[PDB]
Amino acid sequence: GSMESTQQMAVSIINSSFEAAVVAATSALENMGIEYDYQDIYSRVKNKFDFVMDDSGVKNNPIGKAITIDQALNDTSRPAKLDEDVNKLRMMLSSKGIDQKMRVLNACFSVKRIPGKSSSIIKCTKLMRDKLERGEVE
Amino acid sequence: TQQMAVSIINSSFEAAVVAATSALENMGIEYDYQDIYSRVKNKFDFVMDDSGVKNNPIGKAITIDQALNNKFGSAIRNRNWLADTSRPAKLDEDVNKLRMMLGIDQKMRVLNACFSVKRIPGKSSSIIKCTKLMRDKLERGEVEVDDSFVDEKM
RNA sequence: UGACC
């Protein structure tokens, strides 16, 4: 059930770009203090984005290539949606002022007070452990 | 494909601008095109760059181009990654961490003093840097940082 | 030369 791995990956290019745009738009207005309706900005972005990419062949084209690739190579559905959600959440957070340094460290470590002491306890989470099994700079 | 991905990314920016700009007008709120254009552009450029997401799609577009030039190595890697038995578990843990983020000040103060976050050019993932002392200490278990050291580093 | 935050 992985015989569409390339097409699934290729769609995240369109979908993640779309999500980036919604975030950019809603976030900018928000930073201006202007009140707005999420669905309204969401719909306007989709209207413009869909018209340009989905009517100029640049989605039918990318997908077509992805399909040509999957045939040559020839479930995976769940891990692809989650891949897309990771891009979305990161961007949503990024837009709010919680950059990468904050996200990486907060996700890689848990920190505790330590009661009758003037120090903190740091522990690696599963994400940090996997990085070690891969690569962390000494 | 890479040029198409770039194209799609720019069309996305155009959409964010038209959405904000058209949203202000529909609500009877004045605005200068250049002003709104600039605001959306800083946010979009910052978001796409800081998220590592720009590198993700341009990177993905590049492995398709390669597969089109008969170098399926990367595409093969893409299928194996998505097929890994623990892929969903790993992304779920990833996604869960980020969603809980939507405090952390004290936590960041301590962390900002012991670790540095970097990025390998082109990559969407990150690189964490520390001292061999910390690394070896971490590669053993819990680690106590003294509130004095942190302060020694702002 | 994306693979994870």
Question: DSSP per residue over chain A, as a string?
Answer: --TTHHHHHHHHHHHHHHHHHHHHHHHHHHHTT----HHHHHHHHHHHHHHHHTTSSTTHHHHHHHHHHHHHH---SHHHHHHHHHHHHHHHHHHTT--HHHHHHHHHEEEE--TTSSEEEEEE-HHHHHHHTT--B-
Nearest to A95 by CA among A44, A40, A26: A26
Which 49-88 residues of chain A approach strand C with CB closer than 7 Å? 83, 86-87
Domain ranges of chain B: 1-102, 103-154
* B26: CB partners within 8 A, 6+ apart: none
A122 bridge partner residues:
A111, B143
Which value, to the nearest 10 degrees, does the dihedral of the CA atoms of residues A68, A70, A72, A75 take? -170
Q: Which nucleotides in chain C lie less than 7 Å from some protein C-beta? A: 1-5
Structure resolution in Å? 2.5
Give me the sign of the Cα torsion angle A43, B6, A80, B126: negative
CATH of A98-138, one of 3.40.1390.10, 3.30.70.1610, 2.40.50.100, 1.20.210.10: 3.30.70.1610
Method of determination?
A: X-ray
- Crossing angle, helix A5-31 and helix B73-83, to 10 degrees? 80
CA of B140 vs chain A CAs: smallest distance (Å): 10
The pairing of strands B143-146 and B127-129 is unpaired
Return the exposure string of B64-93: e unless at least 16 CB atoms fall within 10 Å of the residue's CB, then b. bbbbbeeebebbbebbebbeeeebbebbbb
How far is the first Cα of chain A from the last one, in angstroms, to the nearest whole number?
40
CATH of A1-97, one of 2.30.300.10, 3.40.50.300, 6.10.280.20, 3.40.50.2300: 6.10.280.20
Per this entry, what is the length of chain B?
A: 154
